[PDB]
């Protein structure tokens, strides 16, 4: 259910077969870091995307 939201946010086009997995179907981003919330958990943030 999150595939559409992820693709809209980043720009990644989903790949269902390795034959079509090419560079042009990737979503460039400035940073992709997993941060911790002072011991309350972990969150992965992708902040800064070309063509947001």
């Amino acid at each position: 259910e999150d595939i559409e939201f992820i693709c809209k946010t980043i720009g990644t086009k989903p790949v269902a077969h390795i034959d079509q997995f090419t560079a042009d179907m990737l979503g460039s981003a400035e940073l992709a870091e997993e941060v911790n919330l002072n011991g309350s958990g972990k969150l992965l943030k992708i902040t800064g995307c070309a063509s947001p």
Binding site: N36, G39, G41, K42
Partner: protein, 186 residues
């Protein structure tokens, strides 16, 4: 005396509070009776086991007690959260109770427990097995068909007891979370 087509209409509307208050207790009583009646009524030189003795004096090497169940205790012990044996008796019971106590040491995954028969006389004048909320074993009056080894063999022959432990110092675990393990950098 006529007008049998009453069409009670909004009559029951003004009594839903009392009707539902009675109905909640009625449903609880029906559930308790069904759980009680789930077991009852439904069905109410190699041959000499040379390994029996060795299992006997290797079982004594451990002592806690089986939980004594409170009518709703039986309901909510099985309603939530594996193979579980429940003992029904009123104070041969002591022998099989000791057998269950001995077996509980070797079976940490089981929830050996006992409960009074009075709280739950046709079945009282003269061993219940559960797993995941459904009945598996319903052996009643097992004296007709003891030692802990004998009970273990009897339960294993039916394929109910799980098939088969180093001893730690005391304990190691403290919690389980984002421990933030050491990450050497530069």
């Amino acid at each position: 005396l006529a007008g049998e087509g009453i069409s009670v209409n909004t009559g029951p509307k003004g009594v839903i509070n009392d009707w539902r208050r009675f109905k909640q207790l009625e449903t609880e009583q029906r559930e308790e009776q069904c759980r009680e009646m789930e077991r009852l009524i439904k069905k109410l030189f190699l041959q000499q086991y040379r390994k029996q003795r060795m299992e006997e004096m290797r079982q004594q090497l451990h002592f806690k007690q089986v939980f004594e169940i409170s009518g709703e205790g039986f309901l909510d012990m099985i309603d939530k959260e594996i193979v579980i044996m429940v003992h029904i008796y009123e104070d041969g019971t002591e022998a099989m109770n000791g057998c269950m106590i001995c077996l509980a040491a070797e079976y940490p995954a089981v929830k050996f427990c006992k409960v009074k028969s009075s709280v739950i006389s046709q079945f009282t004048r003269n061993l219940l097995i559960y797993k995941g909320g459904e009945l598996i074993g319903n052996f009643v009056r097992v004296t007709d068909q003891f030692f802990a080894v004998d009970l273990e063999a009897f339960l294993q022959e039916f394929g109910l007891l799980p098939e088969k432990l180093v001893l730690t110092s005391v304990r190691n675990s403290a919690t389980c979370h984002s421990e933030d393990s050491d990450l050497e950098i530069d």
